[PDB]
Each structure stands twice: as C-alpha cells, then as structure tokens.
C-alpha cells in the first residue's frame, strides 16, 4: 500500500507493545512535553510570583525544597486567565518569574490525559471489547480538570489552580475550605463516600475472592501458582464466597452474580468521584457548602453554637491568614 | 444520539461561561453582577471612600509595593489593585466612563465619579455571586442573615453539572454505538476471541 | 494502554485486600504518634532557612501560617475549659481580612 | 539547607539493604534449574 495507508496501519496496530492510535498521536507529544517540563521545573525552576504581588514562592529542589515542600507553582495572579506561552514573555527569565511552566504543564497534561481517555476507548474497539473502561477513567480525569482548569476559570485566575506539588496540594485544600466550606458540601461528602466506600469494597472483594480460592497448591507454594494465565475455569468458588457474605450480613445483601458485583465495584467509586469533581467544579462558581453559622438561637436570641460554628472558627483562621499580603479591601470575593 | 449528546455537552459548557462572564446578554441589572464585576466594584468602592477621606489614590503604595488602589496590567493599562488585578479584563457600564485610552484615568477618577457609580459599585460589591447551598449570601464564614445566591451561580453550576454528565453520556453512547455496529456490544465471542488470534506482545 | 497488567487473578485479588488494608494500618500508626503530639509538624532545615532569610517562602511555610490562624481563631470556643481570652490585637491576620 | 547529616546515610541504606535482599533472592531463583 501507499505510505499513508501503511502509517495508519502502524498507528492503529493491535500489535504494538504500547498501543499508539489516533488519540495517541496527540497524547504522546503532549504528555512528553508536560512530563519533561514538569521534571526540569520541579528540580531547577526559580521562585514564582504566584499571587502577583512580587512575593516569589520557591517550588524547586535546587532552590531549597524537598520532595514534600516542592512544587511547580501556579502562574501569577497578574496574568489571571490570560494565555501565557513561552513566546508571550520577553525572556525565559520573565517566563520563569511569572510561572509560565505551570501553564505549559497543565495545558499539555489536560490535553494528553483527555487523549489517554480517548485512547482507552480506541483500543477497546480494536480488541473487540466493550467500551466503557474510558467512562470509569472520566472520573479521575474530571477531577483533574476541576482543580487545574474549572476552578481557575470560575475564580478568574490560574494562580488559584492546584499547585503541582505535595504541600501545594494541601495549601489548595485548606484555602478551599476557608473559601467554600467544602467539608459541608454534599458533593464532597458523596466523594468521601465514593473513596472510603471504594476502599472498603476493594478490600471486601479482594478478601472474599481470596477467601474462596480453590485448593490447587501445596503449603510450600504460593496459592497464586494455583491460577494459570488464560485458564478457562474460574479460580475461586463464588457460591462459597456468597455463602459466607450472605451469612455475614443477610442473604439478599450479598451478590451471587459476578457481573452485578463487578458493575457495583465500578459504579460506586466512579459515581462518588464524579460528584467529588462536580463539587469542586460548582464551588468554582461559588455555590458553597451548607452554612449553619448561628443557626441555633435561644429564647432571648443568644446564639447557641453548634459544631458548625466551631468549623466556622477554624475556617476564619484559614481565611484571615491565607495570602497575608494580597488583600487590600475587606472582602475576599475571588 | 451520541453526536447530539457531545454537542449539548459542549453547548452546556459554553452557556456556563456565558452566564459567568457576560453582562450584555445577561444584564447585571437582572442577573446580579458577575464575579469579576463585584470584585472590581469592591476596589472602586474603597477607592471612592478613601479618596473622599483625602487619600491620593494614584500615589498610594500598598504593603507589597504595588499601588493599593491602582496599578498596571502586564501590558501597562491602569487597573484596580489588590486581588482584583486578575479581573482587569472586566468591562461594565458603571466603570467605562472612568476608562481612557491608557486604562483607568486618574483625572476622571479624581473629578468625575458620579453618585450613581458609587451606588452601583456598592450594590455590586454586596451582591457578589458567593453564597452557601442553603442560600446564605456571603463568604463561607458569613453569619446567617442575608438570603442570597446569585442567579449567575445557580445558572453556571447547574449547566456545568448538566454539560459534564452529557459528556459522560456522549462517551457512553458513542462507544456503545461503535461496539454494537461492529457486533460486540454484548461481550466477546468465546470461540472467536480476537486477542487469541493476535501475536503475543513479547 | 498502561504498560503493565495483571496476569494472575489470584494476585490481583490479594492485592485488592493488601492496598486499602495496609493504607489504613499506616494511618493508625501516625495517629498513635499524634496521641503524644509526636507530629511531623516541621522540617527543621526549612525553619532555619526561613528564620534567617525573609525572602525565602515555600508552600510549607504558607501552610504553617494557615495552621497558626486555625489555632488562634478556633481555640477559645473549641477548648472552653482553657478560658482563653485573645484580645483582638493578638489574633494573627494578614492585611484587610 | 541545614539538613540532618545522617539523612544521607539513612536514605542510602534504607534503599540499598532491602533492594539488595530482593536482588539476591531474584537472581538465585533465575539460576535454579530451568
């Protein structure tokens, strides 16, 4: 065939050790660009004026950070949502001061990860598989979009995007609590149910299957040798597992259908994490957690504090201290 | 269905940003100020107040070294200072009379701010689109009293939720449509499992 | 897709027990340390640098400022038996807020 | 940065001692009769 035809055949080959594909044609270069820029910035970038007040924050290892404190720091509040590619800067030195690497990394990463999701659909189709693994990955992907793109858009600045760093992440969490009372938001509560329940059902499933593995090995060998890649026979007794779990709770609380069981395993965390993502993405537009501050009042009108008011006091501590030189007027409105 | 799901998802996202930023087809008289608008209105409010008290707002250096009221944008335009520096792209009818070819004009600021501009800027500052899910208006630490969540927040948040789940339905249905068209949406044929006819990866 | 995959179903399911069970056990140990205030609160090298260099700032120093706000603002109501009275003038606050 | 001077050796041995334990066990497994 012609060059193009052979190229297409190669790009879409089910035979490549790593699947390429058309999504991969975009994913590969964008992920490589984000990864390389990230690694170099995390090691060597100079301090970045995240809040646009000429107060540069040091993110990199060579400038006095460790793995836990280091970050690629968000772009300057002076930039806002303006697009700041390298060629918009007068010099690499200016680009670095203003947090150019952050934009480069996150835009390439978001594009690349969205293509990772497409690529998962793509390969499933090449392999004659059902197509929805890519829908499960939409949950973490939605969450990355929420913290690196939707939230900054709502608030008018990439300087309020999540920093690319471990301590930076906690900074974002704490400020987010002061500003949105996220803990009191039901979508974040559903996210907690999603991740705690995902952990729970992960352990539950692991333990129930492990508990009913069919004896195929001796006491000297790992039982894992009792399963051979590609064998036709199921390797555990689901009727035994259901027999156990139906008795632990009650019969109709347990699955005896593996397909229903595995659907539940997919659905519970994916749905909870979609609500986590939508929590961040709607607090992006300042629809915030429940506010019961001073909700309980006695017969005279004295305020009777509840645990909500004690939350409020912790939130106030975060609010009054955060970005301590950046506010000149009494309300923090974004 | 799937092509339409993708298109409605896209349109949903667009509407979200429209109601959040645009004050022409979503007049602030009816929908409340935009987030950028209310933040700028706050700086305007205190510039007005403090200049009434005698401050020279052009020369007032804030704690950071940047002007407390007025500073430059990264391309030189005179803009409000403090955190609202991010919102200098904002434009609205109550503010434009103060803007000259170089951005905010100090002489117009010192001499031409009308009472209707002060009122609008105080109204918009105090109707910023921030509030709780139970409709307590204000920052998250605010006490109960003011029953307010901006129509802008309700409309942006709802449409983002819808647009997102519509993206999910697009992927759900576009991938199902592909699989059903090729004949494997119900599972893999045990005697015609494609991967068993392929060479090993290694 | 990812470069690696399970090939052993038994290993897969044991790993699903292993990961969350081990993570919860690790969190429990950190909490036993917090029972004694034996915290990972600080990096001493960060503090020595920041004490001597008022231009040195990291996300780690930013978060301790948040902690200091949380302690001062929440303690009087959260710890009523202490009878804390913190006059306005002593409360840590940044500019304006 | 004024780091703990024992950080380096603690980190080095933390990696090396169990990594070498594993390598010893892997290699002698491979050398067992095919």
């Amino acid at each position: 065939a012609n060059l193009w035809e052979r190229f297409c055949n190669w790009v879409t080959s089910t035979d490549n050790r790593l699947y390429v594909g058309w999504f991969g044609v975009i994913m590969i270069p964008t992920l490589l660009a984000a990864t390389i820029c990230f690694v170099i910035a995390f090691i060597a970038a100079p301090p970045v004026d995240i809040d646009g007040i000429r107060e540069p924050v040091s993110g990199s290892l060579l400038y006095g950070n460790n793995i836990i404190t280091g970050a690629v720091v968000p772009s300057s509040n002076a930039i806002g949502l303006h697009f700041y590619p390298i060629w918009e800067a007068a010099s690499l030195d200016e680009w670095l001061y203003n947090g150019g690497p952050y934009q480069l990394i996150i835009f390439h990463f978001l594009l690349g990860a969205s293509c990772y999701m497409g690529r998962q659909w793509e390969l499933s189709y090449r392999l004659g598989m059902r197509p929805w693994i890519c829908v499960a990955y939409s949950a973490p992907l939605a969450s990355a979009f929420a913290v690196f793109l939707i939230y900054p858009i709502g608030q008018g600045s990439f300087s309020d995007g999540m920093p690319l760093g471990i301590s930076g992440t906690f900074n974002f969490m704490i400020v987010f609590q002061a500003e949105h009372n996220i803990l009191m938001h039901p979508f974040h509560q559903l996210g907690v149910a999603g991740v705690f329940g995902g952990a729970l059902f992960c352990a539950m499933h692991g333990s129930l299957v492990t508990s009913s593995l069919i004896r195929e090995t001796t006491e000297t060998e790992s039982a894992n040798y009792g399963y051979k890649f590609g064998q036709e026979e199921e390797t555990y007794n689901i009727v035994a597992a259901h027999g156990y779990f139906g008795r632990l709770i009650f019969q109709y609380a347990s699955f005896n259908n593996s397909r229903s069981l595995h659907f539940f395993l997919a659905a519970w965390p994916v749905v909870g994490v979609w609500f986590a993502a939508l929590g961040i993405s709607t607090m992006a537009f300042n629809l915030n957690g429940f506010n019961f501050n001073h909700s309980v009042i006695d017969a005279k009108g004295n305020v009777i504090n509840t645990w909500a008011d004690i939350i409020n006091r912790a939130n106030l501590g975060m609010e009054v201290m955060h970005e301590r030189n950046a506010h000149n007027f009494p309300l923090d409105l974004a | 269905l799937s092509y339409s799901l993708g298109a409605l998802s896209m349109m949903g996202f667009i509407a979200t940003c429209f109601v959040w930023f645009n004050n022409t087809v979503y007049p602030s008289e009816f929908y409340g100020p935009t987030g950028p608008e209310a933040s700028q209105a706050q700086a305007m409010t205190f510039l007005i107040r403090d200049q009434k008290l005698g401050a020279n707002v052009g020369s007032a250096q804030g704690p950071t070294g940047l002007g407390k009221y007025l500073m430059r944008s990264p391309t030189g335009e005179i803009i409000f200072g403090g955190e609202t520096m991010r919102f200098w792209d904002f434009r609205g009818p109550w503010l434009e009379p103060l803007r000259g070819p170089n951005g905010l004009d100090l002489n117009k600021i010192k001499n031409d701010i009308q009472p209707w501009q002060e009122r609008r800027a105080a109204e918009y500052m105090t109707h910023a689109p921030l509030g709780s899910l139970n409709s307590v208006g204000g920052v998250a630490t605010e006490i109960n009293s003011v029953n307010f969540v901006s129509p802008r927040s309700w409309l942006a948040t709802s449409h983002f939720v819808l647009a997102f789940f519509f993206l999910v339905g697009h992927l759900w249905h576009a991938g199902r449509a592909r699989a059903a068209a090729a004949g494997f949406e119900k599972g893999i044929d045990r005697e015609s499992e494609p991967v068993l006819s392929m060479p090993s990866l290694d | 897709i990812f470069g690696i995959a399970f090939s052993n179903k038994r290993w897969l399911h044991f790993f699903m027990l292993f990961v969350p069970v081990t993570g919860l056990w690790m969190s429990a140990i950190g909490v036993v340390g917090l029972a004694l205030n034996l915290r990972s609160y600080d990096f001493i090298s960060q503090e020595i640098r920041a004490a001597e260099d008022p231009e040195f700032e990291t996300f780690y120093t930013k978060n301790l400022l948040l902690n200091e706000g949380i302690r001062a603002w929440m303690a009087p109501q959260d710890q009523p038996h202490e009878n804390f009275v913190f006059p306005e003038e002593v409360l840590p606050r940044g500019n304006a807020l | 940065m004024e780091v703990n001077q024992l950080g380096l050796i603690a980190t080095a041995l933390f990696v090396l001692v169990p990594s070498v334990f594993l390598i010893i066990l892997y290699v002698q497994t491979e050398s067992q009769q095919k």
Binding site: F229 | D202 | - | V3, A12
Partner: peptide, 30 residues
C-alpha cells in the same frame, strides 16, 4: 546532597518503569 538524593531515587524509579514494562516476565497462555 539532598537534591542529588531525591533526583537519584526518582531516576531509579523511571529506570524501574522501563524494565518493568519492556523486560517484564512475558505473560504466557495456560
């Protein structure tokens, strides 16, 4: 010395990724 240590561990992990993918124990059917 600390920067060197952190980057050294990181580099070992990326190398490990490479061997774990391209020099894995190949999966063999049955």
């Amino acid at each position: 010395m600390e920067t060197i240590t952190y980057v050294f561990i990181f580099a070992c992990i990326i190398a490990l990724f490479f061997f774990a993918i391209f020099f894995r124990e190949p999966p063999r059917i049955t």
